[PDB]
C-alpha cells in the first residue's frame, strides 16, 4: 500500500505548493517538487525552507 | 497515403533517437548516483532539443586534409541505412512485407562498415585511421556470428519471411528454445553497435573517438543518430526474434504495445550493461569471438539444424 | 571549568568492520546446467 | 605482520570444476555486477540542487579576504605588515602612513586574488584580527582586473560579509 | 515503386539533414583551424602512411568464412526437401568443414592475431 | 518590426547554447581533481546539460584547470585554436587565472590570459567544486545575454 501512499503524497505536494499554478511555477523555476517548513523570509524576498 | 505511412515511420524514430540521448544520460546517472539532466524543462524532457539545436548551429569544420566528398557521403550512408533498415520490421502489420526481410536487414546491417571506413580515412587523422580499421574489423568479425545465429534461429521458424516470425513464437518465447544462442546473439549485437563493453573504437586513452573525431556539428551528429538508431533497431530485432508477444488480428494495438515494451526493456539492458562493465581490449575483443564465440555458434547451428529433422518438426516453408 | 575537547565516548567506539563480507549467492553449477537444459527441452517440446 | 592477498588456489573436484565452468560459460560474476548496479539504480540519488541548496561548510572555511573593523567602526588594521611578511604568494601589499588622527592605517592595502592561494595564513598572522577570510566563495568574475582587489574593495567586503565573519569568529576563536 | 519510394524518401531526408548541417552555420574561415589534431598536437607527418599491420590475416579469413556462410544460407529452404537424409549429412559436412577450417586456422597460429 | 522575430529566434539559439555547453576538461593540477569532485554525485555537473567529457573537436568551453607551464603553452594554444566557435574559455584556480603560488617561477606563464582569452575568471586554490559550478552558471547567464542576430540585423 506504500505505492498508493506515495501516489497520495505526490498529489499532496501539488496542493502544498499553492495549487496547480504554484506547483508548476516551482517545478519550472526551482526544479523542485517537495514542500518544507517556512523557517524565515529575508527583506529581499527569498523564502527559506 | 503510402508516403504518409513512411513519414510516420521515419519521424517518430527520430524523436525516439532524440530522447534516447536523454534516457541514457538519466539511466546512467541514476545507476551511478547522479540525478541526470532535469534542468531543461520538466525532468530534463527538453534537454535533447537544446543539444540538437546547438549541434545544428555549431560550426561544422571542414577537415583541411580531406576530400569533402566522403566527409559528406559517410554521414549520408550511416544515417540513411540506419533508418531504411527499420523498413521491414514486423509491427503487427509490417510496413514492407519483404519475403526475405531478415536477410534483407542482415545485409543492410553490414553496410555500417561503409560509413566507418570513409569516416576514418577521409578525415585523415591518426586516431581516425586507427579506429577505422579497428572498428571495421570488430563489426565484420561479429557479422559472421550474427549470420550463423540468424540462420540457426530461423531453421525453426520456416523461412526468411520476418512477418511469420510471430507465428513461429505464438505459444512460447523463442528464447526458451535458443537461450544459449540468444545469449551469444545479444552480445554480438552489443559488439556490432560499438557499446562501452565492446566499443573499442572510442577508447578515450589511445583512440579518443576512432571514427567521429574530425566530424563536427551536423555530420558528426548524424553518426550519433545512426549509432543510437541501430541500438533501438537491433534491440527490437532481438525482441521479436526471441521475446515473442501475442497478436490478435482484430486488435493490432496489443502486439504494438507489447513490442515497444520489449524494445524499451532491451535498450535499458544495453544501458545497464554499459553503465557497469569495463571495456574490452582489441586482443581480447577478437579473442572473445574467434576463440570462444564462433566454435560454440557453429556447434549450436549444427544442433539446431539436426533438431527439426530428428523431432520430425520441420517448420512450415510457406 | 574542566578542559574539554573532541574526545571519544567513554565506552570507546563501536567496532568498525573491515573484513570483506562479499556475499555468496547462486545455485550449484549442476543445478544451473540442469535448469537451462530443462527450459531448453520444454522449448523444443 | 602481513597477509598474502592472492594465494587462494582453487580445488579440482567435480563440483568445483563444474561451478567454475558454469561461471565462465553461464556468466555469473557479470550478472553479479549487473545486479549490483541495478541496486544502485533504485537507490536515493545523491545530488544537491545548486544554487538553491549549497554544500555543507564549517566555521573555519577559508574564502574571500576582507578587512574587519572594531565595534566603534574604526578599522582594526594597524598596518603592522605581518600579513605581507607571511603570505607565501606575496599577494598582499601595504603602504602605511601617519593618519590625520594619527593611527597608522594603510594608505594602500591590496590583495592580488589571482596570486592568493587561500591559505588563511594572513588571519592567523594578524594580531588584531583585522584581515580575515569570509565564508563567501561566490565571487567568480569575468575580468582579471575584477579579481585584483583594493583597500576599498576589501573594506566593502568586510562591511557586506560582517555578521557572517563576526558569528564565525565567535564560534572559532576558542579553537585558534 | 513502394519499396523504392521508401528508399528515396530516406536518402532525400538524410541529404536535407546534411545540407542544413553543412550550410546553415557560419564560420569565420581562418587558416590556423585547418591544422590537424592529435590529443593536443597534430598527427605530425602521418595518418596516410602505409599501415604496417598484422590482423590482415583475420581480415582475409573473415572473407573466406563469409563465402561458406553464403553457402550455408539456403538451409531454411533446403530443409523442405524429400531426401532429408542427404541434406542432413551434407549440411553437416559443410559445418564440419567450417569447424575444420577454423581449427587449422587455430593451431597454425592463423586466427591468432599476428604479432 | 524585425527585432521581435530576430530576438525570439536568437533567444532560442542562445538558450540552446547555454543549456548544452560541453567542457573540454583540460585538468593540469589539483584544480582538475576539484573539478572531478564537481562532476561527482554531490554536485552532478551532468544535470545541467554540461557533459564534462568532450573531445576538443566537439566542445564549447575549456576549463583551464591548474598551473599552465611554458612547456604546456604551445599545446594549449593548438587545442584552443582548433576549438570551434563559439568557444568560451573559463580559467579556474589562482594559478590559471594569473600566476598562482608559482607566480614568480621560470617555466610557468603568469596567467592563461597571456596564452588564451578567458571568459570567466574563477578564483580559488582550489576553487571549491560549487564555486566552479557557480562560474559555469555565470557563463550560462552570459550565454543568455547574447545578441548575435540582433547585432547582425542592427549592424
Ligand atoms: C524551428 C527552429 C527550432 C526547432 C526546435 C523546436 C522549437 C524550439 C524549442 C521549443 C521548446 C523550448 C523553448 C525554450 C525553453 C526554455 O528556454 O526553457 C524552457 C523552460 C525550462 O525552465 P528552466 O528550468 O530552464 O528555468 C531555469 C531554471 N534555473 C533558474 C534553475 C536555471 O520551461 C518552460 O518554459 C515551460 C514549458 C516547457 C515545455 C513544456 C512541455 C514539456 C513536455 C513535452 C516535451 C516534449 C515535446 C516538446
Ligand atoms: C533550426 C535553427 C534555427 C535558428 C538558426 C540560427 C542560426 C545562428 C547562426 C550562428 C550565429 C550567427 C547569426 O545568428 O548570424 C550570423 C551573423 C553574421 O554577421 P555578423 O556581422 O553579425 O557576424 C559577426 C561579425 N563577423 C562577420 C566579423 C564574424 O553573425 C552574428 O550574428 C554574430 C554576431
Ligand atoms: S590566504 Fe591570504 S595570506 Fe595566504 S597567500 Fe592568500 S592572500 Fe596571502
Ligand atoms: S597583519 Fe593585520 S594588522 Fe597587520 S598589516 Fe596585515 S591586516 Fe593589518
Ligand atoms: S590554483 Fe591552487 S589548486 Fe589550482 S593548480 Fe594552482 S595551487 Fe593547485
DSSP string, B161-225: -SSTHHHHHTTS-THHHHHHHHHHHHHHHHHHTT-TTT--SS-TTTTTTSSSSS--HHHHHHHHH
Q: How far apart are CA B208 and CA F54, in angstroms?
A: 10
Q: By C-alpha distance, which of A34, A30, F39, A26 is closest to D46?
A: F39
Burial tier of D87 (Cβ tally within 10 Å: 0-12, 13-18, 19+): buried
Asked whether D30 lines ligand 5 (CB < 6 A), one says: no
- Rounded-to-integer distance, Cα B252 and Cα B278, Å: 41
Residue F12 corresponds to which cell in the numbers above? 532560442
- Which element (helix H / strand E) includes F63? strand F61-65
Give dist(CA B304, CA B298) in Å, integer.
Answer: 10
Give CA–CA dist D153/D136, Å, rounded: 14
Q: Which of B44, B50, B209 is the closest to F15 by Cβ?
A: B50
Interface of A with D in 1-49 (CB under 8 A): 30-32
Least Cα distance to B229 among B4, B17, B2 occurs for: B17
Q: CA–CA separation, B151 vs E69, rounded Å?
A: 9
Please indicate, yes or no, if residue E101 is contained in any of the structural domains. yes
D52 touches chain A (CB under 8 A): yes
- Solved using: cryo-EM
Strand pairing partners for D96?
A: D106
| Residue E115 covered by a domain | no
| Residue at E38 is within a domain | yes
Residue D150 bridge partners (DSSP): none
Place of cell 533508418: B83
Q: Which residues on chain D are in Cβ contact (under 8 Å) with B30?
A: 41, 45
The overall longest dimension of chain B from CA atoms, in Å, is: 64
Contact B290, E58 (CB under 8 A): yes
- Which residue on chain B is closest to D46 by alpha carbon? B33
- Residue A47: its H or E element: strand A47-48
Given C25, C29, C36, which is nearest D18 (Cβ)?
C29
Grid cell 523498413 in the structure block, residue: B87
Nearest to D130 by CA among D72, D78, D59: D78
Q: How far apart are alpha carbons F126 and D69 in whole angstroms?
A: 28
**Going along B4-134, which residue ranges are E strands?**
none
Whole-angstrom distance, CA of residue F74 vs CA of residue B106? 48
Residue B318 and residue B315: Cα distance in Å, rounded?
Answer: 9
DSSP state of D172: T
Dihedrals phi, psi of F91, to nearest 5 degrees: -105, 120
Whether residue E40 is contained in a domain is answered as yes
Domain contains E113: no
If you ran DSSP here, which 8-state letter would residue D93 be given?
A: E
- Look up the domain containing E31 and give its range: 1-108
Three cell numbers, residue B93: 502489420
Burial class (CB in 10 A: 0-12, 13-18, 19+), B290: buried
Q: How far is CA F144 from CA E38, F68, F141, in A?
A: 33, 30, 5
Listed in sequence order, the residues at least 6 apart from F12 whose beta carbon sits closer than 8 Å to its beta carbon are B53
Cα F84 to Cα B61: distance, rounded to the nearest angstrom: 7
Does the distance separating the beta carbons of B273 and D40 come in below 8 Å?
Answer: no
How many domains is chain E built from? Answer: 1
| Other Cβ atoms closer than 10 A to E60 | 10
B187 phi, psi to nearest 5 deg: -60, -45
Residue pair D108/D151 in contact by the 8 Å Cβ criterion:
yes
Report how far apart the first and last C-alpha atoms of chain A are (Å, whole number).
Answer: 29
- What residues of A are in contact with residue B39 (Cβ under 8 Å)? 31
Going by C-alpha positions, the residue among B57, F117, B212, B64 that lies closest to residue E32 is B64
What's phi and psi for F28, nearest 5 deg?
A: -105, -30
CA-angle at D62, arms to D58 and D65, nearest 5°: 135
| CA D1 to chain CA mean position, Å | 39
Phi, psi of D152 (to 5 degrees): -65, -40
Q: Please enumerate, by residue number, every residue of D annotated as part of a binding site for [4Fe-4S] cluster.
A: 65, 77, 80, 83, 87, 109, 116, 119, 121-122, 126, 133
Environment class of B26 (CB within 10 Å of its CB; exposed 0-12, middle 13-18, buried 19+): buried
Is residue E55 one of the residues assigned to a domain? Answer: yes
Q: How many CB atoms lie within 10 A of CB B218?
A: 23
What is the spatial distance between Cα B122 and Cα B124, in angstroms, rounded to a whole number?
Answer: 5
Helix (H), strand (E) at residue D67:
strand D65-67
Q: How far apart are CA F95 and CA F124, in angstroms?
A: 9
Q: How far apart are CA D104 and CA D107, in angstroms?
A: 9
Task: Give CA angle at F96 (F91, F100), nearest 5°.
Answer: 140
Distance (Å, rounded) from C-alpha B237 to C-alpha D25?
A: 24
Do B36 and F53 count as a contact with CB atoms less than 8 A apart? no
Distance from the D141 Cα atom to the nearest Cα atom in chain B, whole angstroms:
24
Residue pairs between chains B and D whose CB atoms are closer than 8 Å: 32
- Sheet containing F61-65: order of strands: F61-65, F88-92, F120-122
**C-alpha cell read off for B257:** 504495445
Between CA D64 and CA F94 the distance in angstroms is 12
CATH number at residue E19: 1.20.58.1610
- Which positions in chain B have a beta carbon within 8 angstroms of at least one beta carbon in chain C? 172, 174, 176-180, 307, 311
Q: Quick check: helix, strand or coil at residue F37? A: helix
Specify which residues F65 forms β-bridges with.
F27, F92
Element (H, E) at F143: helix F129-144
Distance of CA F47 to the CA centre of its chain: 17
> How many of the other CB atoms lie within 10 Å of CB of E53?
10
Residue E49 lies in a domain: yes
- Å from F130 to nearest chain D CA? 8
Largest CA distance in chain F: 58
Check: CB of residue B259 under 8 Å from CB of residue B239. yes
Give B141's contacts (C-beta < 8 A, 6+ positions apart).
B286, B289, B290, E58, E62
Angle at B96 between CA B93 and CA B101, to 5 degrees: 100
User: Is residue F22 a contact partner of residue F58, using CB atoms and an 8 Å limit?
Assistant: yes
Closest by CA to B151, choosing from D126, E94, D77, D90, is: E94
Q: Return phi, psi of residue E47, to 5°.
A: 80, 5
CA distances from C7 to C16, D60, D172 (A): 17, 19, 18
Helix pair angle (E2-23, B68-84), 10° resolution: 140
Q: What is the DSSP letter of E39?
A: B
Cell numbers at residue D21, please? 565452468
CB of F111 closer than 8 Å to CB of D144: yes
Is residue E114, in this structure, part of any structural domain at all? Answer: no
Amino acid at each position: 500500500m506504500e505505492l498508493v501512499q506515495v501516489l497520495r503524497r505526490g498529489l499532496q505536494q501539488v496542493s502544498g505548493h499553492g495549487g496547480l499554478r504554484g506547483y508548476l511555477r516551482v517545478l519550472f523555476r526551482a526544479n523542485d517538487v517537495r514542500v518544507g517548513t517556512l523557517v524565515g523570509e529575508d527583506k529581499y524576498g527569498n523564502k527559506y525552507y | 497515403m503510402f508516403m504518409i505511412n513512411i513519414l510516420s515511420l521515419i519521424i517518430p524514430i527520430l524523436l525516439a533517437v532524440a530522447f534516447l540521448t536523454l534516457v541514457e544520460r538519466k539511466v546512467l546517472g541514476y545507476m551511478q548516483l547522479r540525478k541526470g539532466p532535469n534542468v531543461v524543462g520538466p525532468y530534463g524532457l527538453l534537454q535533447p532539443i537544446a543539444d540538437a539545436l546547438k549541434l545544428v548551429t555549431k560550426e561544422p569544420l571542414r577537415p583541411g586534409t580531406s576530400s569533402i566528398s566522403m566527409f559528406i557521403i559517410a554521414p549520408i550512408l550511416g544515417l540513411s541505412l540506419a533508418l531504411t533498415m527499420w523498413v521491414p520490421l514486423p509491427m503487427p502489420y509490417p510496413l514492407i512485407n519483404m519475403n526475405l526481410g531478415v536477410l534483407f536487414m542482415l545485409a543492410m546491417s553490414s553496410l555500417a562498415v561503409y560509413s566507418i571506413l570513409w569516416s576514418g580515412w577521409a578525415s585523415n587523422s591518426k586516431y581516425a585511421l586507427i579506429g577505422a580499421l579497428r572498428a571495421v574489423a570488430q563489426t565484420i568479425s561479429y557479422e559472421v556470428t550474427l549470420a550463423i545465429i540468424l540462420l540457426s534461429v530461423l531453421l525453426m521458424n520456416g523461412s526468411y519471411t520476418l512477418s511469420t516470425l510471430i507465428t513461429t513464437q505464438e505459444h512460447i518465447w523463442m528464447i526458451f528454445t535458443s537461450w544459449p544462442l540468444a545469449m551469444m546473439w545479444f552480445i554480438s549485437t552489443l559488439a556490432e553497435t560499438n557499446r562501452a563493453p565492446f566499443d573499442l573504437t572510442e577508447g578515450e586513452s589511445e583512440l579518443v573517438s576512432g571514427f567521429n573525431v574530425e566530424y563536427a556539428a551536423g555530420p558528426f551528429a548524424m553518426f550519433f543518430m545512426a549509432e543510437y538508431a541501430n541500438i533501438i533497431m537491433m534491440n527490437a530485432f532481438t525482441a521479436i526474434l526471441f521475446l515473442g508477444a501475442s497478436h490478435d488480428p482484430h486488435t493490432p494495438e496489443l502486439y504494438t504495445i507489447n513490442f515497444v515494451l520489449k524494445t524499451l526493456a532491451l535498450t535499458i539492458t544495453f544501458l545497464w550493461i554499459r553503465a557497469s562493465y569495463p571495456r574490452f581490449r582489441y586482443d581480447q575483443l577478437m579473442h572473445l569471438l574467434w576463440k570462444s564465440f564462433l566454435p560454440l555458434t557453429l556447434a549450436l547451428c549444427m544442433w539446431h539444424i539436426s533438431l527439426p529433422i530428428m523431432t520430425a518438426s520441420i517448420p512450415p516453408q510457406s | 571549568s574542566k578542559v574539554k575537547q573532541d574526545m571519544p565516548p567513554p565506552g570507546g567506539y563501536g567496532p568498525i568492520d573491515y573484513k570483506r563480507n562479499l556475499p555468496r549467492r547462486g545455485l550449484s553449477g549442476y543445478s544451473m546446467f540442469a535448469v537451462g537444459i530443462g527450459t531448453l527441452l520444454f522449448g523444443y517440446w | 605482520t602481513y597477509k598474502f592477498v592472492n594465494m587462494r588456489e582453487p580445488s579440482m573436484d567435480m563440483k568445483s570444476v563444474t561451478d567454475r565452468a558454469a561461471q565462465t560459460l553461464l556468466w555469473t560474476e557479470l550478472v553479479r555486477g549487473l545486479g549490483m548496479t541495478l541496486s544502485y539504480l533504485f537507490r536515493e540519488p545523491a545530488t544537491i540542487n545548486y544554487p538553491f541548496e549549497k554544500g555543507p561548510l564549517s566555521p573555519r572555511f577559508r574564502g574571500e579576504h576582507a578587512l574587519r573593523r572594531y565595534p566603534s567602526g574604526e578599522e582594526r588594521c594597524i598596518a603592522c605588515k605581518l600579513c605581507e611578511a607571511v603570505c607565501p604568494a606575496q599577494a598582499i601589499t601595504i603602504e602605511a602612513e601617519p593618519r590625520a588622527d594619527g593611527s597608522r592605517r594603510t594608505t594602500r592595502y591590496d590583495i592580488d586574488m589571482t596570486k592568493c592561494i587561500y591559505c588563511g595564513f594572513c588571519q592567523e598572522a594578524c594580531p588584531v584580527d583585522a584581515i580575515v577570510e569570509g565564508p563567501n566563495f561566490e565571487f567568480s568574475t569575468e575580468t582579471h582586473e575584477e579579481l585584483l582587489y583594493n583597500k576599498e574593495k576589501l573594506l566593502n567586503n568586510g562591511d557586506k560579509w560582517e555578521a557572517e565573519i563576526a558569528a564565525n569568529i565567535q564560534a572559532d576563536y576558542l579553537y585558534r | 515503386m513502394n519499396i523504392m519510394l521508401t528508399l528515396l524518401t530516406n536518402v532525400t531526408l538524410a541529404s536535407l539533414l546534411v545540407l542544413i548541417a553543412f550550410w546553415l552555420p557560419q564560420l569565420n574561415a581562418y587558416s590556423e583551424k585547418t591544422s590537424p589534431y592529435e590529443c593536443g598536437f597534430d598527427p605530425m607527418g602521418s595518418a596516410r602512411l602505409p599501415f604496417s599491420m598484422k590482423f590482415f590475416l583475420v581480415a582475409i579469413t573473415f572473407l573466406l568464412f563469409d563465402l561458406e556462410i553464403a553457402l550455408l544460407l539456403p538451409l531454411p529452404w533446403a530443409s523442405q526437401t524429400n531426401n532429408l537424409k542427404t541434406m542432413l549429412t551434407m549440411a553437416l559436412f559443410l559445418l564440419i568443414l567450417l569447424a575444420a577450417s577454423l581449427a587449422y586456422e587455430w593451431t597454425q597460429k592463423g586466427l591468432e592475431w599476428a604479432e | 518590426r524585425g527585432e521581435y522575430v530576430v530576438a525570439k529566434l536568437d533567444d532560442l539559439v542562445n538558450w540552446a547554447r547555454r543549456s548544452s555547453l560541453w567542457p573540454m576538461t583540460f585538468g593540469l593540477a589539483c584544480c582538475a581533481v576539484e573539478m572531478m569532485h564537481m562532476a561527482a554525485p554531490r554536485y552532478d555537473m551532468d544535470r545541467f546539460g554540461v557533459v564534462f567529457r568532450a573531445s576538443p573537436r566537439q566542445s564549447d568551453v575549456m576549463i583551464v584547470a591548474g598551473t599552465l607551464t611554458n612547456k604546456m603553452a604551445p599545446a594549449l594554444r593548438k587545442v584552443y585554436d582548433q576549438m570551434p566557435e563559439p568557444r568560451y574559455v573559463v580559467s579556474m584556480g589562482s594559478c590559471a587565472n594569473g600566476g598562482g603560488y608559482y607566480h614568480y617561477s621560470y617555466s610557468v606563464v603568469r596567467g592563461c590570459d597571456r596564452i588564451v582569452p578567458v571568459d570567466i575568471y574563477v578564483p580559488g586554490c582550489p576553487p571549491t567544486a560549487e564555486a566552479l559550478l557557480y562560474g559555469i552558471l555565470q557563463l550560462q547567464r552570459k550565454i543568455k545575454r547574447e545578441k548575435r542576430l540582433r547585432i547582425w540585423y542592427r549592424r
